[PDB]
Symmetry: D2
Subunit: 308 residues, 4 copies
Amino acid sequence: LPNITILATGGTIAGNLVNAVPQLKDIANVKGEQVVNIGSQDMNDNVWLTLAKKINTDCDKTDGFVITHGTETMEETAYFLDLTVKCDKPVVMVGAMRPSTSMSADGPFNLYNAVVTAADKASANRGVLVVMNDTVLDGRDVTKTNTTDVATFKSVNYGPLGYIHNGKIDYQRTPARKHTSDTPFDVSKLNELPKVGIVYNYANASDLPAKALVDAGYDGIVSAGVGNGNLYKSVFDTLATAAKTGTAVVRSSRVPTGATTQDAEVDDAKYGFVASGTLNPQKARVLLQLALTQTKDPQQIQQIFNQY
Amino acid sequence: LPNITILATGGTIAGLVNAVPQLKDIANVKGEQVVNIGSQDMNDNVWLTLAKKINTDCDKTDGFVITHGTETMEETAYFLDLTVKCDKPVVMVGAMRPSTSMSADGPFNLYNAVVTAADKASANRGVLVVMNDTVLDGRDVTKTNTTDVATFKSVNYGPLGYIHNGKIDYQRTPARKHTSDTPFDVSKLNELPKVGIVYNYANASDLPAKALVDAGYDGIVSAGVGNGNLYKSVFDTLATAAKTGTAVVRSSRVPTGATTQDAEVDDAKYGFVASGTLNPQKARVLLQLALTQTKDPQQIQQIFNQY
Amino acid sequence: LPNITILATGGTIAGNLVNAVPQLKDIANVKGEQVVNIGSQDMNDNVWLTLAKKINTDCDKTDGFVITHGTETMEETAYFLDLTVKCDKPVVMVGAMRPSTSMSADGPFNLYNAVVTAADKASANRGVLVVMNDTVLDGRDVTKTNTTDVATFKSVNYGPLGYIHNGKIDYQRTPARKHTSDTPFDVSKLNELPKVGIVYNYANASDLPAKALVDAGYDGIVSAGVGNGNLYKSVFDTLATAAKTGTAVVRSSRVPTGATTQDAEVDDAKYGFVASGTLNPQKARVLLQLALTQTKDPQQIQQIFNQY
Amino acid sequence: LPNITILATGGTIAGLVNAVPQLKDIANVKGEQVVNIGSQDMNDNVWLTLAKKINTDCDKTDGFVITHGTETMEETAYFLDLTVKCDKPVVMVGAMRPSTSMSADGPFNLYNAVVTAADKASANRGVLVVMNDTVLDGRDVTKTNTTDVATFKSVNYGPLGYIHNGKIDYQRTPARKHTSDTPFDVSKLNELPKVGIVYNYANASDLPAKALVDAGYDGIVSAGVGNGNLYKSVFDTLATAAKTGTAVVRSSRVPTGATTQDAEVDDAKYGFVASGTLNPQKARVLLQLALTQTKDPQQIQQIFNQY
C-alpha cells in the first residue's frame, strides 16, 4: 500500500487517527505528526512557512500528504501551499464542519476520502487539493460558502476537479493557472513574508483602517471593494496616494464570485493598481505577499496576477 | 393608472418615460433627481435624505421606484427597509450593464420595477429590490457576482416572487419586522452613529480595529472567519473595546449562513452581539440604527433577533 | 415533553430508534409504527392514501409526526401530504443520503432535527415539512437536486423556511399557497386516485409513450416539456388530440427550476392545456390527480394550479 | 480579420452583420440558413446535416458560430461535441428573450460568440456554448431555468471561461475526449439508431416503456429517481428488454450528479449501463452513437466512461 503522511495542524477531526478510523489501513500505510496545534482562525505566516518547508523537505520519504486543518482559513493555507509546494506528490487538505463528537460528524469520511485522494496516482500534478463532502477541489478556486453547512466548500467560479464515489475519483478537470513546481516562488530560505493587510469597502466607509496600514509601512494593501472592485471616495484617495509612494495595492472585491477586472471600473494603469481577477481578498493577499518577495513593480505584479 | 414616482440617485439606467415608452402603459410616471453619485460613494447623508423624502411624499403617490447603483444597493435597501414609514411599495432597481451597451439590462429592469411598484400585492412586503425578473426583499438580497446581470439573489431565504409578463407570482413575504413596524425613526436626525467594519484573515493586523477605537467609533462590525470567529489580535482588541463602551457585532465574510450566538465565541462573556444572517455591510446598517436607541449589548442582540 | 409519533415507511435511517439515537428522549416522548416497508423508488397511490388516512385519524392522539421515508420520491409524497393532511399538528418528513452503517452517516442527526422540528410550536401551520441537512423545507418547493450529496434537498425556486442551529429554528418564511386544512381535497373515503402519467420531451422524441397512455384511458398526462413548457412536434399533436377528447394535460418542464408559464410558448387556451407554474413534472402529477377527483374542466384545473 | 461562418438553424436572435454592426470589428462574417425550425422540433436529420456541413466546410473558414434555440441546445451541443472532426472552434449561441423585447440578450450573446470563435485559444476545447458572458463545454452544459437569461450552466464541473470586454480567461478544458478524438463518424449515415426516454416517478406506468420495446427501439434511456433507481414496473420491463437485445442506460431525473455504476442497481446482472453525469437527454445522444458501433452492454459502459 502507498505511504501517506498525515500532517496535523489543530485538533483531531475524527474520534491515533488510524485507531479512530480503522478503514484507513485498507487503503494506506498511515503515519501522522502534529506540526502545530491551533484553531485555524489563528493561522499565520509562521505556520504557513513551516508547513511549506516541511512538505518540501519530507517530499521524498512518502507518496502523499494529507493535511488536517480548520475550515475557517482553509482556503487561505490551501492557496499558499498551491504556490509554494515543490513536491510532485499529492498534497490534500481536509477538515470537518462538525465536532468529532457530534452525531453525524463529517470528519471521519472526509478524512477517509482525503487519504483515498492522496493515494490516487491520478491526483498528482493537479496542485494542492482540498477534499470535502465527497468532492475534490483545487486550492485556488475553493472557498468557504456557508458558515455551518457540511457542504460549504465549493469552487465557486470554475468548479471542482472531481467527485468521489466508493473510493474512486472521476477527474474531469485540472487547474490551468500554474501552481506548485511551476511557480517562481520559493520560501525555503524565508523567515517572514512581506506585510499585506486587507481593507473593506461599504457605504460611508472610513479611511482610517487604510491609513493605519500605510502609516505602519505595510508592503501592500488588498482592497475588498464593492461591485467590480470599486472603492469608496475616501478609501480611494488614501490608496491612490499610497501607491505612488511605493505601497502596492490590489483591487479585489467583497462580492463572493466573479473576477475583479482590469481597467474596467478604475483606471488601474493611471493609479498603479493591480486587479485581482477571480481571487477574493484573502486569496489575493496570499499572492500579493508572494509577488512582493519578487518585485515591487505594479506592472509586473499584474502579470503575476494573470499567471497564477 | 397608478401614479408612480421615480427617485433617481445616480446616472440613468436606460436610454425615462421617453427612453422606455412602454412605461406609460402601466403607470403615470414622474421623476426627480434627489442626488447624483455613483453608489460606491453612497453615504449617511444620502440615506437620511432618501428616507425623509419617501416618508414626506408618501401620500402624494401610489408607489416609489428608486434608481440606484448596484455596488451598495443591498445596503441602502436594508436601511430603507428599516426606516421608511410609508404603506406604499418602495422598489429599488439598477443595471449591471451601461445603458449604451448592446443588450443593456436597465430598460426591462426599470419596466418590471414600475410594474412591481404598481401592484397592489406588493404593499406590506417591506422595501423591495427588483432585478432580473425577480422580486427580492431588502433584508436578504445581496450582490453575488461582480458582473453578471443575474447577480442579485436572496442567498439565505430566497426571493419573494418572479415576474412574467407584468404579472407577479408572490409566494413569500418577509417575517422579520420592517418599515412601519420598527421603532427606528430618522426623520429628526442629521447624522447616524459611527460604525466601521474590519476584516479577518490569516495573520490579520489589529491596526484597522485600533484606528476606529481610537477615533471613538460607536461600534465596529467584524467580518469574521467561519462562524463569526476572529483572529487572535483582532479579538483582544475588540474584547477590550467592548468593555469600555464600544459595541461589537460578530458577522462573517462567508457570504451565506448565519453567524450564530454563543457557538464559536462566548458572546455573553465579552459583550459581543452575533449578526445572524446579516452580512457585515448589512450588520452595520442595523447596528447604526440600534445605537440611536441603546448602547446595551444585551439589547442590541434582541434587536438583531427581531429585525 | 411533547409526544411525537414516528411513522416509518422503509428501512431505518439510524443505527427502536430511541435506543439507536438516545438523545431523542431529551426533546420528546417518541413512539414509532411501521406503516409499510418498501424502498421509496416503489412508492405508489396505495401507500399515499394509507399515509394520509393515518395522519388524519391519529391526529388527536399526538403533538407531532415525523415520517421516515426514502429520498428518491420524498418530494412527491411530501407534496401529496401537503395537500391532503387535515391535522393542525406538524408533519415532518426525513431521510438519509447515506446508509446508516456508513461512516459519517447522516440519518441520526437528520432524525434528531426532524423530531426537534416536529416538537416546535412554531412549526405548526406551515404545511407539510421536510427536514434535511439542518434545513426546514416546505413540501411544495422542495426537490432532489443531486444524486448523492447529503445536501441534495433544496427549495429551488423560493427557498427554505428555516435553518436549525442547536435545536433552535430561525423561521423567516412560510408558504403562501394554500395547504393542508385549506385545501378542498379529501381522500379519506378514496381507494384509488385518477391515473396520471408523465411523458418526457427531447429532440426527435417519440409519440408512442404518450399514445400508450391515451389508449389505456389515462385521466391525465403530465408533459415534462423542453424550455418553458414546450413540446416536440409529435408529442404536441398527440396531446392536443387527447385534450379535446377529455384527457387532461398539464404542461410542465424537464428544466429543474422556474415556472412553466401560461399562454407564453403554447396557446394553452386554444388547446385546453394547463400550465404547471413552478411545479416540476412529478409534483404536477400529484396536483393533477387531486384536481381530477374534483373536476375535468381545464379552465378550472388551471385555477387550481394557480392556488395550490 | 478571421473569417467566421454563422450557421443559422432557426429565427434570428438579433434585430446579422447589419443588426449588430460591431461584429465587423472582430470578424469577417458570413452566414447561411441551414434549416429553419424552433428547437423544440430538433431531430436526427438536422443533427446529421449540421455535422456533415461543419466537417465539409471546415477548411474554408477559421471558426463557426451556430445560432440555435435554447430548448434543445444542450442536446445538439453534445452531439456535435462527439461528431465534429474540425480543429476549428464551433460555438453555439442563443437568446432567452425575443430579439424585439427590450433588454434583448441575443445581440451581446452573438457578439461574444463571435469573439469566442475568433479566439485562437478556443481551439481544441470541443464544441462550445456561449451564453451570458460564459464559455461552457458542450458536455456538461444544461438548461437550468425556464426563463432566466442566465439559465445555462455547467452544473457538475463548471464553465471553461468568462468573457470580459472581448477577452476570455480560460481556466479549464474538458478531459473527456471529444470531436476528433472520438470514433464516431456520421459522415456516411442517413439515420441514427432509435433511442427513447422514459421517466420514473411514484406509481409510474410501464406502458411508455413497453411501447418502445414493442416498436423495436434499439435503446431506452431511463430518467430514474435518485441515484438512477427505477420503479418496480419499469424495472421488470427494462430488465426483460435488456436480455433480448435492447440496450438500457440508467440515468436520472435529478438535475446534477452522476448516476453511478452498480450502486443502487446491479448493472452487471441485468446488463444495464449507468450514465455517469450525463442527464437523460444527453445520455440518449451518446447511446445512439455507441449503438452505431456496438450492441454490447459491457462495451457501451466503457464508452460511457470515456466520452
